[PDB]
């Protein structure tokens, strides 16, 4: 639903409830393996501003399953919500969930 369209590819923003098994983001590795998700990430993250160190932020480091995932907590929520609001007006986060950025190489925003 909440998504942005590019050239036969789309980046969807979703809210999930269950804890993922993803490990911490390694930004140098995440940059080298897939730069598209990384520059997207840093465009988003600068809008996010201050992200609490004591909220998890995990990465796929995969090209078939390209996901960046924030953790929405008491402290995480205000900065994450202010950022997502800039792009999407129907995405309102809530505590104890995870906002996950997946990249799809050939599916589109429809």
């Amino acid at each position: 639903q909440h998504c942005i369209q590019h050239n036969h590819s789309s980046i969807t923003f979703s809210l999930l409830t269950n804890k993922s098994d993803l490990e911490k983001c390694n930004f140098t590795r995440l940059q080298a393996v897939d730069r598209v998700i990384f520059d997207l990430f840093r465009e988003f993250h600068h809008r996010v501003g201050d992200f609490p160190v004591t909220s998890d932020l995990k990465c796929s480091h995969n090209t078939s399953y390209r996901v960046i995932e924030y953790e929405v907590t008491k402290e995480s929520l205000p900065r994450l919500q202010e950022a997502v609001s800039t792009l999407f007006p129907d995405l309102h986060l809530s505590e104890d969930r995870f906002l996950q950025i997946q990249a799809h190489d050939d599916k589109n925003c429809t």
Binding site: K24, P52, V53, T54, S55, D56, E75
Partner: protein
Amino acid sequence: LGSPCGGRLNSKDAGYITSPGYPQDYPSHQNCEWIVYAPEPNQKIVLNFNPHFEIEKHDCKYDFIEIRDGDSESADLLGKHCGNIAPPTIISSGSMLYIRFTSDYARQGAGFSLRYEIFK
């Protein structure tokens, strides 16, 4: 005396143990070890953390503080804490307490601070 952090402390005078730079952000790649002991073998040690407590949480796999009941690192684990909420009062069972702070390469926070003394 090269060590940047840690050491053996005598608890007859109450003191404090803090992450390097607390309340400012602790360094990366830290590996501090403390041993606090009671002067005489009957006494026991009690720790109390300050409410300000900021250690990177990831099921405490990267940055964490751990407390065990004895001298070695192999002593029974009393707690391994990270995240936003300071741990409750810890009371030693014997007369030696082992404390260790570990930092990884990436992200840091304010860290921890506690105060050690003899119980009662």
